[PDB]
Design a protein around this ligand. Structure first.
Ligand SMILES: CCCCCCCCCCCCCC
Ligand SMILES: CCCCCCCCCCCCCC
Ligand SMILES: CCCCCCCCCCCCCC
Ligand SMILES: CCCCCCCCCCCCCC
Ligand SMILES: CCCCCCCCCCCCCC
Ligand SMILES: CCCCCCCCCCCCCC
Ligand SMILES: CCCCCCCCCCCCCC
Ligand SMILES: CCCCCCCCCCCCCC
Ligand SMILES: CCCCCCCCCCCCCC
Ligand SMILES: CCCCCCCCCCCCCC
Ligand SMILES: CCCCCCCCCCCCCC
Ligand SMILES: CCCCCCCCCCCCCC
Ligand SMILES: CCCCCCCCCCCCCC
Ligand SMILES: CCCCCCCCCCCCCC
Ligand SMILES: CCCCCCCCCCCCCC
Ligand SMILES: CCCCCCCCCCCCCC
Ligand SMILES: CCCCCCCCCCCCCC
Ligand SMILES: CCCCCCCCCCCCCC
Ligand SMILES: CCCCCCCCCCCCCC
Ligand SMILES: CCCCCCCCCCCCCC
Ligand SMILES: CCCCCCCCCCCCCC
Ligand SMILES: CCCCCCCCCCCCCC
Ligand SMILES: CCCCCCCCCCCCCC
Ligand SMILES: CCCCCCCCCCCCCC
Ligand SMILES: CCCCCCCCCCCCCC
Ligand SMILES: CCCCCCCCCCCCCC
Ligand SMILES: CCCCCCCCCCCCCC
Ligand SMILES: CCCCCCCCCCCCCC
Ligand SMILES: CCCCCCCCCCCCCC
Ligand SMILES: CCCCCCCCCCCCCC
Ligand SMILES: CCCCCCCCCCCCCC
Ligand SMILES: CCCCCCCCCCCCCC
Ligand SMILES: CCCCCCCCCCCCCC
Ligand SMILES: CCCCCCCCCCCCCC
Ligand SMILES: CCCCCCCCCCCCCC
Ligand SMILES: CCCCCCCCCCCCCC
Ligand SMILES: CCCCCCCCCCCCCC
Ligand SMILES: CCCCCCCCCCCCCC
Ligand SMILES: CCCCCCCCCCCCCC
Ligand SMILES: CCCCCCCCCCCCCC
Ligand SMILES: CCCCCCCCCCCCCC
Ligand SMILES: CCCCCCCCCCCCCC
Ligand SMILES: CCCCCCCCCCCCCC
Ligand SMILES: CCCCCCCCCCCCCC
Ligand SMILES: CCCCCCCCCCCCCC
Lengths: 196, 196, 196, 196, 196, 196
């Protein structure tokens, strides 16, 4: 029965948003979690135990695997999803204490709106930042043969990845679902400015 | 005691459905989850660690396994089940905010119905889409010997899968339970049109 | 405090059953789950990683293991337990919406009974069906040496299973607890007919 | 607030027991679970993967491990603990429906007592039964060298177990805690008879 | 709202304790659990799979590992923490039924205090008992080389442990946090006697 | 509905803090947990199973791995996060019993403030202590080749770590998020003194 006070909190947090963003993005947050922790986490399980290279030099598979994967895509997308969720969480924690301050006033314009704008800016700005890093480093694909030239391997060794194509499809899903997230925040950002 | 408000929400979401779909499909959603995450998830555990090929060429088992399995059936069926559930979830989130908008009206035809129709269309349309992809790629069976002709293997190598018959039976269950899902949405789709 | 409405639902679902079936079968459902997911699931963990055969032919252990186990007993008994539980779940979901239809009637014989009979028939009929399949395929024991004659092995190879005796005892428990389930539904089936 | 009805159910189930059994056995049930599923389950993890024998005969470690362990002690003690708990659970489910039958009587001697006696008999009788089986099979110790004479091994092979002493200490705890359970039910059994 | 009855139970259990023990020991119970099941449980994961010895004698690593570790420190500290918690749990279960007996008296000195004294004695007495056993067996350190002289190894073999220094630091934490537990119960024990 | 009493407890614990620390640090506690147990725990999974050294000397990989990692970074950061959380937990448990003492007074300055100051001091003081230890031992990086000179290896051996660069990035995140924690407690510490 104590959900009646929670109804006031979920109303005031989304009083400035449209009728289409709170139904599409909230499902998109549930979608991105359920894709990440259930389907694709088990896919990157043997990212190192199957990585075989064509040499006898001991440790050459240790230093060549790292050059291909400075940071794996799974711990990348977990690093991304907290950074896109944290401006919403920070706005949620602030609006709760603001509501509590006003409940202890009545029994004995523009202040809330600025941080609501900033909360959607850093949602996109971190999202563009994590995309171009992936283009700068990994691209949006995976080749089935890597040629490695680090030390202490000899001249050039051939290292064969573990499931390039299965890792390819879940990369493009993480590109598309992030890109439809990015456009879905931009359309809110026009609506808050064009109101006046 | 706060389930009385939830009783109004579960009534309005299924006010257009028949008396037979909400009892058969809701159990079919519980059935498909319980078959997937409990029985058949452990069956595809060693999909790569048992895949042995008949060669000495290093990495030939890495590139030949991929040609047989571009995407494994388990991460396929998890990818399918979210896409069939998401039009129901999207209709659920929309009808909640529509109900909340009308609760803040009375204390101080055709609008809901169109998206209810669209919500059942994309349930079937994604379901037909995922079936024919499996026929285009994997078929509905698994052979116990795969002949591989990728690079850098030699001329032709023999690769032996891991449990073809146990993977065969759970494929046909995922075909049958998806097909009885597909017919169970079609029978609703006639009933909403033939009402008038 | 909202368990008072749940008290009406658990009364009407078992208004036709005896005083002895709802206390013995409900514990038997808790018993079969707790035996399956806690004790015997870990026993069939290394069903493939310990299966060794007496040959050098690569992949001969892959194709010979399958002939011994087309479907493992653990994923068999999980497949069985959902099929015996689903007619009870389907009767539970139907009787809830029937109760809700009558609650929206009073504020502004024989119909329920037929599907209650059918719900106990398919509990036994699926149970007899899964038993004879095991007799047709696996029997009710496990021998400690399997002789395999599939391809591409040579003439005949000896393959040694993993824990035949520990798998033997839990098979007989799954035979006995299923058989005492089968007789406990039959005794209900006489009581509903002999009432008149 | 709906724990007030649960207070009547936990009173009537233990109206015939002493003030010392419901405080000592209920903690003993919590003790035996917490010892089993947390401490000693991880100890029997590598019961097969460390079992090495002194031969080259392939599969000789498969058939010799079984003769030493027809059923492992962990799946034995899980099999024991359900059988000692099931007469208490069966008495709990029966006394609930008996209470419900009398609640639907008042708004519009000796019957309960017999099954309470039987419920404590089968607690001890199954407990004595599982103890002597262990004495008939395993004893109450483990030797660090097993001599195996099964087929298809040669004349006699030496097989070395995995952690005999760590498995020895948890056997004696499972003997002592079962024996203090057995005496704690007997002392109740005198008290119910000597009341008259 | 039914926490008001729980407020009476948590008051009467600690009516004889000081204002400093219920705030320091209750956090110390939360600390010792969170250190044990989260940090140091994963540290002792490969206690056997990394234990390598310097011989070819088959099974010599099985019988030499046991002499170094008759019982591992993790299953020791889990065995300790239940024994220090069980006198508090036994006093909690007794004081609940004592409270229930007096609630069924008013609607139609020295008795509680003795078992409160005994409950703190066996907390320390078991704690001193488990400490000196560790000094009698393991000491409070771990050496990086063990020399083994059991059978059927030859004259003397060198066995190298798995992470001695990481296991050293968590031993001293389990010594310090147990010792600050032991002094924190003694200071209560003076306060109950010196009251009179 | 019993969250109304919890509203008084969460008000009195933070009556001396600013409006910016309770919204930024509480999210920072949720951030550091979610980074630790989800993203970086799986990264340090094979910290030993991939550590290969360039020798044939048995056990040389056991004693050389330890010199590189006396305590792994994951069990370090878990050891850190409990020590920074424990002064907040201790202040939470104390303020609850202080509130309960005053509730049993009214139905029949400076005392709280001192321990609030001490609770923030030991948050920073333990945080500076764990940082400089890492600088004294590990630094803030990881090199891809370790040269080992322990016994019983020969003169000098080369040991290659497992993923130095992926472990490098999560170290700097654990430095930055700890450092922004350290400055966020200092800014509170000025505010409590400069109030008067
Ligand atoms: C009385 C009607 C108001 C009840 C509001 C409850 C909805 C808020 C919960 C939304 C989050 C649920 C996550 C599953
Ligand atoms: C690798 C396992 C992934 C499991 C899910 C990851 C959850 C991390 C994001 C949680 C954000 C919650 C914000 C409210
Ligand atoms: C060794 C060659 C250079 C490697 C640089 C890797 C940079 C990866 C940066 C990832 C940043 C993700 C968190 C913002
Ligand atoms: C009075 C202070 C309120 C702070 C509310 C949070 C504002 C948005 C913070 C966004 C941080 C973006 C970088 C991670
Ligand atoms: C009345 C609303 C209760 C549920 C709110 C849950 C989120 C509150 C913000 C989370 C951080 C607050 C610090 C405890
Ligand atoms: C009204 C409250 C204003 C809050 C200001 C916060 C602005 C963002 C500061 C942090 C940006 C850089 C974070 C890495
Ligand atoms: C030294 C070359 C490293 C190249 C990758 C650097 C990644 C740094 C990420 C910083 C993120 C800044 C977001 C505004
Ligand atoms: C007062 C009667 C109305 C109560 C309605 C409760 C039923 C709605 C819950 C259905 C989902 C339950 C999932 C297990
Ligand atoms: C591979 C493990 C499978 C576990 C179950 C998968 C659940 C994913 C579907 C959840 C959809 C929920 C919609 C309400
Ligand atoms: C390498 C030969 C071509 C492989 C193509 C594989 C296509 C798999 C498509 C799966 C799509 C599932 C998500 C819609
Ligand atoms: C006002 C907007 C309401 C939106 C409700 C959801 C409609 C159905 C969306 C189905 C999406 C199908 C493609 C995944
Ligand atoms: C009153 C109903 C509460 C339970 C509803 C749970 C589903 C609501 C839709 C889920 C998304 C809403 C965004 C928080
Ligand atoms: C009344 C609300 C209408 C909603 C329109 C949504 C139609 C579907 C658009 C997305 C289809 C393509 C998704 C891949
Ligand atoms: C390049 C050849 C790839 C063949 C498989 C392509 C699969 C694409 C799936 C698109 C789904 C569209 C659903 C309407
Ligand atoms: C060569 C032997 C192949 C065996 C295939 C067995 C197929 C069984 C399908 C079971 C489906 C049952 C539908 C209810
Ligand atoms: C007021 C008395 C009626 C309360 C009925 C509660 C019993 C129904 C629950 C039975 C299932 C419990 C599973 C653990
Ligand atoms: C292999 C792990 C087994 C875990 C338990 C299996 C549960 C499946 C049966 C659940 C049926 C629930 C019907 C109400
Ligand atoms: C390859 C030789 C024939 C194998 C047939 C295996 C049939 C197994 C049928 C199991 C059916 C279980 C689901 C009904
Ligand atoms: C009006 C329709 C009610 C349906 C209730 C369920 C009847 C029993 C179905 C049993 C199915 C057995 C085959 C799995
Ligand atoms: C009032 C009873 C609430 C609990 C009932 C739980 C089972 C209801 C049937 C489950 C399927 C209903 C579809 C949501
Ligand atoms: C009164 C409701 C009657 C329901 C009829 C259902 C009978 C069973 C039909 C399905 C049997 C075959 C399932 C494989
Ligand atoms: C082709 C030979 C296969 C032999 C096993 C067939 C099993 C089919 C199971 C069908 C179940 C029907 C239950 C009524
Ligand atoms: C109003 C006082 C009666 C409340 C009775 C609650 C005690 C019954 C619960 C005992 C089992 C608890 C298991 C943790
Ligand atoms: C091997 C893992 C053991 C986990 C605990 C086993 C629990 C089985 C006994 C449960 C009996 C519950 C009776 C109420
Ligand atoms: C192969 C030599 C005879 C082996 C007999 C093993 C008997 C084990 C009986 C265990 C019974 C436990 C359940 C009652
Ligand atoms: C009217 C029937 C009541 C049955 C209550 C249970 C009696 C005790 C059964 C004990 C079974 C012991 C063998 C497992
Ligand atoms: C009013 C008491 C509710 C809680 C009782 C939980 C145990 C009831 C017996 C369990 C089997 C009953 C079949 C649903
Ligand atoms: C008053 C109820 C009497 C119940 C009789 C049950 C006696 C035990 C019968 C089963 C004993 C054999 C089980 C293996
Ligand atoms: C064939 C020799 C087997 C020896 C072990 C038999 C164990 C049978 C257990 C039966 C339990 C009976 C309890 C009353
Ligand atoms: C009305 C005020 C009394 C409420 C008492 C609640 C505190 C007792 C719970 C202490 C244990 C909590 C463990 C997290
Ligand atoms: C090895 C995993 C350790 C997990 C925590 C162990 C908990 C055992 C102690 C629980 C005592 C509870 C007393 C109330
Ligand atoms: C084989 C040499 C003697 C080994 C004796 C080991 C004794 C360990 C006793 C541990 C007792 C812990 C529970 C009280
Ligand atoms: C009337 C009996 C009350 C018993 C309460 C518990 C007393 C303390 C028992 C401590 C046992 C210490 C040895 C484990
Ligand atoms: C009214 C208090 C309910 C919660 C008490 C939980 C502990 C009670 C003692 C635990 C053993 C009691 C046997 C069921
Ligand atoms: C007032 C209740 C007295 C309880 C007496 C219990 C004393 C301890 C007896 C057990 C000590 C030995 C346990 C191993
Ligand atoms: C036979 C030599 C064994 C040496 C270790 C014995 C440990 C026994 C522990 C008994 C604990 C007694 C506590 C009072
Ligand atoms: C090598 C062994 C070193 C042991 C040092 C620990 C001695 C006890 C220190 C903790 C005392 C705390 C008293 C409050
Ligand atoms: C009636 C309004 C007061 C309700 C206070 C609830 C907020 C306190 C909970 C904060 C912690 C939530 C963690 C998710
Ligand atoms: C290695 C797995 C990490 C899992 C999370 C660790 C949690 C430990 C910190 C919990 C502190 C809670 C304070 C309230
Ligand atoms: C073997 C060379 C000296 C190794 C010393 C390692 C010291 C590590 C100290 C870590 C302390 C962390 C807990 C405070
Ligand atoms: C009356 C005693 C109150 C104690 C409250 C806790 C004070 C802060 C303790 C901080 C301990 C720091 C070292 C871990
Ligand atoms: C009324 C507040 C109940 C919830 C408080 C939870 C934290 C209380 C302090 C935790 C230690 C108290 C010892 C049981
Ligand atoms: C007002 C309460 C004062 C509490 C004093 C606690 C001061 C800190 C003592 C412990 C410091 C050393 C811990 C390792
Ligand atoms: C013997 C050399 C060891 C060097 C590391 C010592 C670490 C000790 C940590 C003590 C922490 C004290 C915090 C105030
Ligand atoms: C030799 C290449 C080393 C690459 C080091 C990359 C360091 C990246 C640090 C990212 C920290 C971002 C802070 C927000």
């Amino acid at each position: 029965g104590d959900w009646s006070a929670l109804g006031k909190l979920l109303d005031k947090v989304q009083a400035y948003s449209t009728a289409g963003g709170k139904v599409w993005l909230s499902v998109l947050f549930i979608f991105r979690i359920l894709l990440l922790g259930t389907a694709v986490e088990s896919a990157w399980g043997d990212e190192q135990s199957a990585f075989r290279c064509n040499t006898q030099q001991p440790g050459c598979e240790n230093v060549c695997y790292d050059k291909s994967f400075p940071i794996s895509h799974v711990r990348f997308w977990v690093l991304q999803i907290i950074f896109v969720s944290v401006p919403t969480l920070l706005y949620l924690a602030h609006v709760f204490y603001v509501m509590r301050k006003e409940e202890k006033l009545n029994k004995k314009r523009g202040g809330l709106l600025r941080t609501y704008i900033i909360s959607i800016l850093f949602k996109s700005i971190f999202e563009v930042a994590f995309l171009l890093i992936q283009w700068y480093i990994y691209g949006f694909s995976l080749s089935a043969v890597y040629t490695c030239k680090r030390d202490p391997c000899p001249h050039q060794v051939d290292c064969f990845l573990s499931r390039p194509t299965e890792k390819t499809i879940f990369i493009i899903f993480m590109l598309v679902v992030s890109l439809v997230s990015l456009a879905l925040n931009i359309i809110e950002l026009f609506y808050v400015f064009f109101k006046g």
